[PDB]
Structure 1
Amino acid sequence: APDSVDYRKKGYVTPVKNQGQCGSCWAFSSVGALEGQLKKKTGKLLNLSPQNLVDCVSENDGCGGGYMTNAFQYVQKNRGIDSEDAYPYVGQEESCMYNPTGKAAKCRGYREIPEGNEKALKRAVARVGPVSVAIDASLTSFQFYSKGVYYDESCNSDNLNHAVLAVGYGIQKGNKHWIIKNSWGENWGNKGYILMARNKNNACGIANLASFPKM
Structure 2
Amino acid sequence: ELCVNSLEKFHFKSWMSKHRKTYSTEEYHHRLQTFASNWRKINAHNNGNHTFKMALNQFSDMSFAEIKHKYLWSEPQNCSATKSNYLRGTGPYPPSVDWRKKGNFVSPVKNQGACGSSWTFSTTGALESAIAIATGKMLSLAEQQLVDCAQDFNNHGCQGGLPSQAFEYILYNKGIMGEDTYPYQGKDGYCKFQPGKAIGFVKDVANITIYDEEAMVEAVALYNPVSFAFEVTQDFMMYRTGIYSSTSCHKTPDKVNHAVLAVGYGEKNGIPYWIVKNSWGPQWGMNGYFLIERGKNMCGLAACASYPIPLV
TM-score, normalising length: structure 2: 0.67
CA shift for structure 1 position 141: 2.0
Residue of structure 1 in register with 2:67 after alignment: none
In the TM superposition, 1:122-201 aligns within 5 A as 122-137=217-232, 139-158=233-252, 159-199=255-295, 201=296
RMSD of Structure 2 on Structure 1 (CA) = 1.0
**Residue from 173, 176, 179 that aligns with 1:84:** 179
In the TM superposition, 1:1-215 aligns within 5 A as 1-9=93-101, 10-58=103-151, 59-137=154-232, 139-158=233-252, 159-199=255-295, 201-215=296-310
Q: Percent identity?
A: 46
CA distance in 1, matches of 2:119, 2:283: 20
Q: Flag the structure with higher helix content.
A: 2
Task: Please tell me the residue identity of whatever aligns with 1:61.
Answer: H
Higher radius of gyration, 1 or 2? 2
Q: Is the 8 A contact 1:35 1:46 kept in 2?
A: yes
Higher relative contact order structure (alpha carbons within 8 Å, sequence separation ≥ 6): 1
CA distance in 2, matches of 1:97, 1:41: 28
Q: Is the 8 A contact 1:131 1:211 kept in 2?
A: yes
How many residues end up aligned between the 2 structures?
213
Q: Is the 8 A contact 1:113 1:124 kept in 2?
A: no
CA distance in 1, matches of 2:223, 2:148: 27
Runs of 4+ in 1 over 6 A off after TM superposition: none
Give secondary structure in 1 for the equivalent of 2:292.
strand
Unpaired runs of 5+ residues, structure 1, are none
CA distance in 2, matches of 1:172, 1:101: 47
CA distance in 2, matches of 1:156, 1:60: 23
CA distance in 1, matches of 2:271, 2:209: 23
Q: Is the 8 A contact 1:148 1:172 kept in 2?
A: no
TM-score, normalising length: structure 1: 0.96
CA distance in 1, matches of 2:164, 2:245: 27
CA shift for structure 1 position 173: 2.5
